[PDB]
């Protein structure tokens, strides 16, 4: 009965179990690294892992693929927006 | 008298003999460069909103964007020489060029 | 209203050919009018006699549905096009494929031939058309710009030289040399699967489940509607006498007057014995070269031939 | 004294609900003929433009105005946020589902197989 | 005034540059205006159907 | 909680690469594009939001939720003129979708630009839209007094939609505001317009009610 209860409750794709575990698994990797990275650079050594990733900074450095809005019959020049 | 506020222009006008830079009815002053594209107007005084759909395109583009493009033209005529294919000589020219 | 439409006599079915083993999807007539050719979803191409209705020959090269055939007026060639992404050139003095045009990325939905120069145009489901050079099998242009399968293509000698209708409900008129769209017509609300050009009038018509529309070359200025046929319309076909045949996908076929747009007959044929009634549908129609017979290729694996009725008059069948 | 009623029906098209909402919002607004006449005496004949007739470059709004439309924006946004009324987590009835996706699929099946 | 002369190509020389680069496709053309006929209504009963 | 600059920037990077891979993955259903732009606006990085909406409209411009979310985003952030350019592009390319005209006019009314709202209503009526649009225009003219404009609109209206019911509404309008001679003229024009071969009850019923 317990094992029948076991089988009937496992709806998530048996791999959909695993990768669900993996998503929370790696959060150790990043969470551990950062504090240890914080502490490492806090100890006074500015380690670089290395810089080689082709499309990574395509997100946080620049507008990924920028399309600026078209202009029409009105002046958009003076508009500017606040910060967070 | 040296006109400084455009009210002194009455209906408008610059005083060429008056040694002042006349700015009559918003005249004279170079303004900020704004983004607004040229609010054009047709050959009858209508507001040619064809512009904003034609955004950044040649004049070869035929752009249907008016209501009058939807209305059934009354071309129930078997006769009009408006619609008859180009004479085969022009077709021969197009064929050679192509 | 309108002046009143010309009287055309009505058409009656007089022959039913059945030898295919899958839907019949395309049909064409030879230049010299002796035989016609059908391509079907059983991957054969059959060649029938037009007088007797006898089957002359069966060509089997494709790997899937043959979705278009055409016979060239300048050379002894038959060009066929399938869902296997391949386009073929059959030479009709040996009955064998001599040339194949490669490069489409999904099924090819239709194909037409240029009447003066030797090029081919094909439309496919990758939402492009291509202009092929008949002689060197090289793709000289990829007409791209639609955003969904390109249901149909027709080409002409005048200008613009290519009209394509696609499933993203748009028509485009292209120039052959430059290779880009001059005009985009977005009047239809549903996929445009049918386009036809008037033989002698510099106008054309485009069919959709909403209604057929007429347009006027060379920049496609709207002319009028033709409404009443509420069905997925697979074909349009125009006679030289202004009869326009609109064949739908539930089997029903309307016959219209081209000039005034007056629907003067509605044919609702019957399905072959062993067929279901959910399997009545017209995929292609073609007028004879004499423009006397009208052949239709149907989803119940038959070819139905209609001829005009000779014993009727304006007072037997008046025009409403 | 006044009286009226408006009953809800099928969502038939998104247009119908949009239109109802516009009706409500329109009825709410109250315009100041003061500012209208003030704006009027400045511009006169420009007030009555056809689609194609007249043109003045741009009308620049006092910020205080802009706040009105922003506030109405936030209001309509909230009212829209409440579109779907949720039915409270009732455990009282028999459980055959294994997760909330399965529970909702079973509910859709209940509507279509009676 | 300048004299253009085209430099000889070495017969035995392989291609020089990497051709295969992938990028997403550009923006299309300016969207054309949708010239439809006005929409009609679907009753609740039809959506039931 | 994110202490500061580098940690929330990594947080940005992770969410951002997640969004961008979703978009690369499907490039279609616009739930992804809208989720993404909603987030980049919630962080008040609205230039990225504008780029996202623009790219989305490049994917599928016939989608009306996209246009509405976009103009809403511009309007909340007080970018009035951006919102105006957007409404203008929208009613230019999708002129049959009525929501756009409604909301454009409503905004311009809130903002106090009544001349602008009339400009938009006129452009709209060029398309001969539908009775509800004409009603909306007339009600707009009636929140302000401008009753002569209202009857001008009604003249165009009953020609565009020649139904007996509309002629009735027109007459009813002018009587409610006490122009009795004019309402009589309306009724006589109605009868002479329709002609016998169609003419039926409802019209006469209302005509009798008026004269009674």
Q: Is the link from the previous residue into C218 a cis peptide, with omega within 30 of 0?
A: yes
Contact (Cβ atoms closer than 8 angstroms) between residue C297 and residue C285: yes
Contact (Cβ atoms closer than 8 angstroms) between residue C14 and residue C307: yes
List, as ranges, residues 5-34 from A with C-beta within 8 Å of D.
Answer: 8-9, 11
Q: If 0-12 CB within 10 Å is exposed, 13-18 middle and 19+ buried, where does residue C203 land?
A: buried
Q: Give the whole-angstrom CA distance, residue A74 versus residue F85.
A: 7
Q: Which of E14, C189, D22, C67 is nearest to B70 (CA)?
A: C189
Residue C41 has a CB neighbour count (10 Å cut-off) of: 20
Which residues fall within 8 angstroms of residue F94, CB to CB, at 6 or more apart?
E33, E34, F61, F62, F64, F67, F100
Q: Does D52 touch chain B (CB under 8 A)?
A: yes
Q: What are phi and psi of C117, to 5 degrees?
A: -80, 165
Q: Does C209 touch chain E (CB under 8 A)?
A: no
Alpha carbon of B33: minimum distance to chain A alpha carbons (Å)? 8
Asked whether the beta carbons of residue B67 and residue F88 sit closer than 8 angstroms, the reply is: no
Integer angstrom CA distances of residue D99 from A11, A12, C200, D86, F157: 8, 9, 67, 17, 56
Residues of F within 8 A of A58 (CB-CB) are: 20
Residue C192 has a CB neighbour count (10 Å cut-off) of: 28
Contact (Cβ atoms closer than 8 angstroms) between residue C72 and residue C79: yes
Out of B36, B39, B47, closest to residue D52 by CB:
B47
Residues of E within 8 A of D15 (CB-CB) are: 39, 41
Subunits close to B (at least 3 CB pairs below 8 A): A, C, D, E, F
Structure token digits, residue B36: 């607004």
Q: In sequence order, what E strands does C62-186 have?
A: 66-71, 77-82, 87-91, 96-101, 108-113, 119-124, 128-133, 139-144, 152-155, 162-165, 171-175, 180-185
Asked whether the beta carbons of residue D98 and residue A74 sit closer than 8 angstroms, the reply is: no
Q: Give the whole-angstrom CA distance, residue D30 versus residue C211.
A: 46
Contact (Cβ atoms closer than 8 angstroms) between residue B41 and residue B48: yes
With the CA atoms of B48, B52, B53 and B54 taken in that order, what torsion angle do they form, in degrees rounded to the nearest 10? 80
Asked whether the beta carbons of residue C224 and residue B73 sit closer than 8 angstroms, the reply is: yes
- Do strands C233-238 and C243-248 pair parallel, antiparallel, or not at all (unpaired)? antiparallel
- Which residue has 């017969």 as its token pair? E11
The reported resolution of this PDB entry, expressed in Å, is 3.0
Q: Give the whole-angstrom CA distance, residue F107 versus residue D29.
A: 12
Q: Give the whole-angstrom CA distance, residue C194 versus residue B46.
A: 38
Structure token digits, residue F204: 């006469």
- The H-or-E segment that residue C58 falls in is strand C55-59
Residue B2's Cα: distance from chain center in Å?
38
Q: Give the whole-angstrom CA distance, residue C295 versus residue C13.
A: 10
Q: Which of F15, F59, F57, F8 is nearest to F36 (CA)?
A: F15
Contact (Cβ atoms closer than 8 angstroms) between residue B14 and residue B22: yes
Q: What are phi and psi of C48, to 5 degrees?
A: -115, 150
Q: Give the whole-angstrom CA distance, residue C200 versus residue C218.
A: 14
Q: If 0-12 CB within 10 Å is exposed, 13-18 middle and 19+ buried, where does residue C82 land?
A: buried
- Which residue has 């445009």 as its token pair? C192
Structure token digits, residue C284: 């292609």
DSSP single-letter state for residue C192: -
Q: What are phi and psi of F122, to 5 degrees?
A: -65, -50
Integer angstrom CA distances of residue F25 from C127, C170, F33, F59, F60: 20, 27, 12, 14, 16
Give the residue from chain E lying closest to D15, CA to CA. E41
Integer angstrom CA distances of residue B11 from B8, B14, D38, D45: 9, 11, 22, 16
Rg (Cα) of chain A, in Å, rounded? 24
DSSP reduced 3-state for C62: coil
Q: Which of C143, C138, C97, C139 is nearest to C124 (CA)?
A: C143
Alpha carbon of E21: minimum distance to chain B alpha carbons (Å)? 28
- The H-or-E segment that residue F181 falls in is helix F180-194
Q: Mark D76-97 as b/e (b = at least 16 C-beta within 10 Å).
A: eeeeeeeeeeeeeeeeeeeeee
Q: How many domains does chain F have?
A: 1
Asked whether the beta carbons of residue E42 and residue D15 sit closer than 8 angstroms, the reply is: no
Q: Give the whole-angstrom CA distance, residue C208 versus residue C246.
A: 10
Q: In terms of residue numbers, what domain contains F110?
A: 3-212
List, as ranges, residues 5-64 from A with C-beta within 8 Å of F.
Answer: 30, 34, 56, 58-60, 63-64
Q: Which of C229, F64, F92, C205 is nearest to E33 (CA)?
A: F92
Q: Does E41 touch chain D (CB under 8 A)?
A: yes
Asked whether the beta carbons of residue E35 and residue C186 sit closer than 8 angstroms, the reply is: yes
Subunits close to D (at least 3 CB pairs below 8 A): A, B, E, F
Residues of D within 8 A of E38 (CB-CB) are: none
Supply the DSSP string of C229-249, one letter for each residue.
--S-EEEEEE-TTSEEEEEES
Residues of A within 8 A of B37 (CB-CB) are: 71-73
Method by which the model was determined: cryo-EM
Asked whether the beta carbons of residue F136 and residue D26 sit closer than 8 angstroms, the reply is: yes
Q: Which of B20, B17, B16, B27 is nearest to B3 (CA)?
A: B20
How crowded is the C-beta side of B51, counted as CA atoms within 13 Å? 18
């Amino acid at each position: 009965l317990s094992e029948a209860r076991a089988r009937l409750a496992n709806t998530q794709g048996k791999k959909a179990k695993r990768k669900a575990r993996e998503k929370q698994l790696e959060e150790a990797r990043r969470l551990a690294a950062l504090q240890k990275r914080r502490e490492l650079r806090a100890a006074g050594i500015e380690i670089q892992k290395k810089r080689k990733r082709k499309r990574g900074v395509d997100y946080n450095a620049e507008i990924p693929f920028e399309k600026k809005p078209a202009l029409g019959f009105y002046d958009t020049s003076e508009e500017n927006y606040q910060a967070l | 008298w040296i006109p400084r506020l455009l009210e002194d222009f009455g209906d408008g006008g610059a005083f060429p003999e008056i040694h002042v830079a006349q700015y009559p009815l918003d005249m004279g002053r170079k303004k900020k460069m704004s983004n607004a594209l040229a609010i054009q107007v047709d050959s009858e005084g209508k507001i040619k909103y064809d512009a904003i759909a034609r955004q950044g395109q040649s004049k070869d583009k035929v752009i249907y964007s008016k209501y009058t493009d939807l209305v059934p033209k009354e071309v129930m005529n078997a006769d009009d020489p408006d619609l008859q294919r180009p004479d085969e000589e022009a077709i021969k020219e197009i064929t050679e060029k192509t | 209203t309108m002046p009143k439409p010309q009287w055309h006599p009505p058409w009656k079915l007089y022959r039913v050919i059945s030898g295919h083993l899958g839907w019949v999807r395309c049909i064409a007539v030879e230049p010299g009018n002796q035989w016609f050719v059908t391509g079907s979803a059983d991957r054969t191409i059959k060649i029938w006699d037009l007088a007797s209705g006898k089957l002359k020959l069966s060509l089997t090269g494709h790997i899937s549905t043959v979705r278009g055939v055409i016979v060239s007026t300048r050379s002894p060639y038959l060009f066929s096009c399938g869902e296997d992404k391949q386009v073929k050139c059959w030479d009709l003095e040996y009955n064998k494929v001599i040339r194949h045009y490669h490069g489409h990325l999904s099924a090819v939905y239709g194909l037409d031939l240029h009447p003066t120069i030797d090029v081919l145009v094909t439309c496919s489901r990758d939402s492009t058309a291509r202009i092929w050079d008949v002689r060197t099998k090289a793709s000289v242009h990829t007409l791209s710009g639609h955003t969904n399968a390109v249901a149909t293509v027709r080409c002409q000698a005048a200008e613009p030289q290519i009209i394509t209708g696609s499933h993203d409900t748009t028509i485009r008129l292209w120039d052959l040399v430059a290779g880009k769209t001059r005009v985009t017509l977005t009047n239809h609300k549903k996929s445009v699967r049918a386009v036809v050009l008037h033989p002698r009038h510099y106008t054309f018509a485009s069919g959709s489940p909403d209604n057929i529309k007429q347009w006027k070359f060379p920049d496609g200025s709207f002319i009028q509607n033709l409404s009443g046929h509420n069905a997925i319309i697979n074909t349009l076909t125009v006679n030289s006498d202004g009869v326009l045949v609109s064949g739908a996908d539930n089997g029903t076929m309307h016959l219209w007057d081209w000039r005034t747009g007056y629907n003067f007959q509605r044919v609702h044929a019957a399905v072959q014995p062993g067929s279901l009634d959910s399997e009545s549908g017209i995929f292609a129609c073609a007028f004879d070269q004499s423009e006397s017979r009208l052949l239709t290729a149907e989803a119940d694996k038959t070819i139905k031939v209609y001829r005009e009725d000779d014993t009727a008059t304006e007072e037997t069948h008046p025009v409403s | 004294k006044k009286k009226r009623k408006n009953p809800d029906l099928g969502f038939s098209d998104y247009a119908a609900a949009q239109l109802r909402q516009y009706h409500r919002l329109t009825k709410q607004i109250k315009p100041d003929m003061e500012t209208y006449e003030r704006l009027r005496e400045k511009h006169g004949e420009e007030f009555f433009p056809t689609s194609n007739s007249l043109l003045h470059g741009t009308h620049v709004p006092s910020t205080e105005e802009i706040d009105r439309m922003v506030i109405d924006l936030e209001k309509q946004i909230e009212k829209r946020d409440k579109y779907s009324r949720r039915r409270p987590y009732n455990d009282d009835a028999d459980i055959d589902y294994i997760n909330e996706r399965n529970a909702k699929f079973n509910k859709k099946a209940e509507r279509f197989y009676g | 005034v300048i004299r253009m002369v085209e430099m000889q190509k070495d017969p035995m020389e392989p291609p020089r540059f990497k051709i295969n680069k992938k990028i997403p496709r550009g923006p299309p053309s300016p969207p054309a205006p949708v010239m439809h006929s006005p929409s009609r209504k679907m009753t609740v009963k039809e959506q039931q159907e | 909680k994110i202490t500061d600059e580098e940690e929330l920037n990594d947080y940005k990077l992770r969410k951002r690469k997640t969004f961008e891979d979703n978009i690369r993955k499907n490039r279609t259903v616009i739930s992804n594009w809208i989720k993404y732009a909603q987030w980049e606006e919630s962080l008040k990085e609205i230039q990225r939001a504008r780029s996202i909406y623009e790219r989305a409209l490049d994917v599928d411009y016939r989608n009306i939720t996209l246009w509405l979310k976009y103009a809403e985003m511009e309007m909340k952030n007080r970018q009035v003129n951006h919102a105006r350019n957007i409404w203008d592009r929208a009613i230019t390319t999708l002129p049959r979708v009525n929501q756009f005209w409604y909301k454009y006019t409503y905004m311009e009314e809130m903002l106090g630009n009544v001349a602008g709202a009339r400009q938009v209503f006129e452009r709209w009526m060029e398309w001969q839209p539908e009775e509800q649009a004409w009603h909306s225009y007339i009600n707009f003219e009636l929140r302000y007094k401008e009753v002569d404009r209202a009857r001008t609109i009604y003249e165009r209206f009953v020609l565009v939609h020649p139904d007996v019911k509309n002629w009735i509404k027109y007459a009813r309008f002018e009587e409610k505001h006490a122009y009795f001679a004019h309402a009589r003229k309306v009724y006589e024009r109605a009868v002479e317009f329709f002609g016998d071969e169609h003419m039926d009850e409802h019209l006469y019923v209302a005509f009798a009610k008026f004269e009674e």
